[PDB]
Design a protein around this ligand. Structure first.
Ligand SMILES: Nc1ncnc2c1ncn2[C@@H]1O[C@H](COP(=O)(O)OP(=O)(O)OP(=O)(O)O)[C@@H](O)[C@H]1O
Length: 321
């Protein structure tokens, strides 16, 4: 009396940022967002539901997780169980394929993979749209990792209408790369910013414009246009935290050094553009045909261990056990 499933999902990096929840219970976002799914970083997850299990168990990278590290997995297991009318405890075993001791966020790839594995194990037979809706309830950004390449999370207005979809780009994403500069809370800083920042309305008033321009850059394969929009959108998101009460920044000293070096690279004719999420690492969007020039430039202040490249990656892969 057991049911099991497995999935692999890749990480994605938001170009137009997800930033603020309109509804916390269902993770419906204040604004739509757009990401690129990456080949380099991913999660592999298996889940087992078994009548003989006596409690929910989460093992990550071979290590038993404690109640605090298991809280998000357990809330996702509870809602997929309630939706199946399933009364069994589960065991989740996951491995994050990311750089060791690097601060990469694996909630996108982790929750997407778990959603896919549960979909298989419980035989939910979800379409890609409904699987994205399910993954959305685990982690907002996970709903975009259902898809490969460019993907947009439409904010919708309800559980039924908030979900992601691939953005056809006539394979332009296979000409692009992202270089991660590894530099020595997301959900709480976001909530504080939505509820208290004098700058948050300025964030909202500019997202739709940014999304339209990204769509137009994609349709014309205009890399400098794309890069300018996404770099400014990321800086706008980080500006909002300085208007929160109390104010805060996600940046570290090394973040600013990296951002400054990207601007210098661009001054020397290397078209590249940075973005940051809720932490200090700096991701650099660059065309493949320019990636080695960019790595050559940043060698002077960063070891090779700090420069990890990534390319466009596929949507979720589901596996029967
Ligand atoms: N492979 C995985 N499978 C399931 N859950 C995972 C996996 N990897 C991480 N998680 C869970 O997702 C959480 C996300 O943490 P992470 O630092 O990677 O991203 P985040 O967006 O900054 O989230 P948070 O603010 O909750 O820490 C982890 O603390 C863990 O509980």
């Amino acid at each position: 009396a057991m049911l099991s499933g497995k999935a692999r999902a890749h990480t994605n990096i938001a170009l137009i940022k997800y930033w603020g929840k309109a509804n916390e219970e269902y993770i419906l976002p204040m604004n739509s967002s757009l990401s690129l799914t990456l080949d380099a970083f991913y999660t592999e997850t298996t889940v087992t539901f078994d009548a003989h299990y006596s409690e929910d168990v989460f093992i990550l990278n071979g290590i038993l997780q404690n109640e605090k590290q298991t809280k998000k997995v357990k809330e996702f297991l509870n809602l997929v169980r309630q939706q199946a009318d399933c009364t069994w405890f589960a065991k989740v075993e996951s491995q994050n394929f990311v750089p060791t001791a690097a601060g990469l966020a694996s909630s996108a790839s982790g929750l997407a993979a778990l959603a896919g594995a549960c979909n298989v194990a419980l035989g939910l037979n979800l379409s890609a749209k409904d699987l994205s809706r399910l993954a959305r309830r685990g982690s907002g950004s996970a709903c975009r990792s259902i898809f490969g390449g460019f993907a947009q999370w439409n904010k919708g207005h309800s559980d039924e209408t908030s979900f992601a979809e691939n953005i056809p780009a006539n394979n332009w994403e296979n000409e692009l790369a992202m270089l991660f500069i590894l530099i020595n809370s997301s959900r709480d800083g976001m909530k504080r910013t939505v509820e208290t920042s004098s700058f948050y309305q300025g964030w909202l008033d500019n997202v739709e414009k940014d999304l339209s321009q990204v769509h137009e850059a994609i349709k014309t394969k205009d890399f400098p246009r794309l890069g300018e929009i996404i770099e400014a959108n990321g800086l706008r998101m980080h500006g909002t935290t300085l208007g929160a009460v109390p104010p805060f920044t996600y940046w570290s000293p090394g973040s600013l050094q990296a951002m400054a070096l990207v601007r210098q690279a661009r001054a020397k004719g290397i078209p590249c553009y940075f973005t940051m999420d809720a932490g200090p690492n700096v991701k650099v969007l660059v065309e493949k045909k320019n990636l080695e020039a960019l790595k050559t430039f940043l060698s002077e202040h960063f070891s090779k261990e700090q420069l990890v490249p990534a390319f466009a990656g596929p949507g979720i892969e589901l596996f029967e056990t």
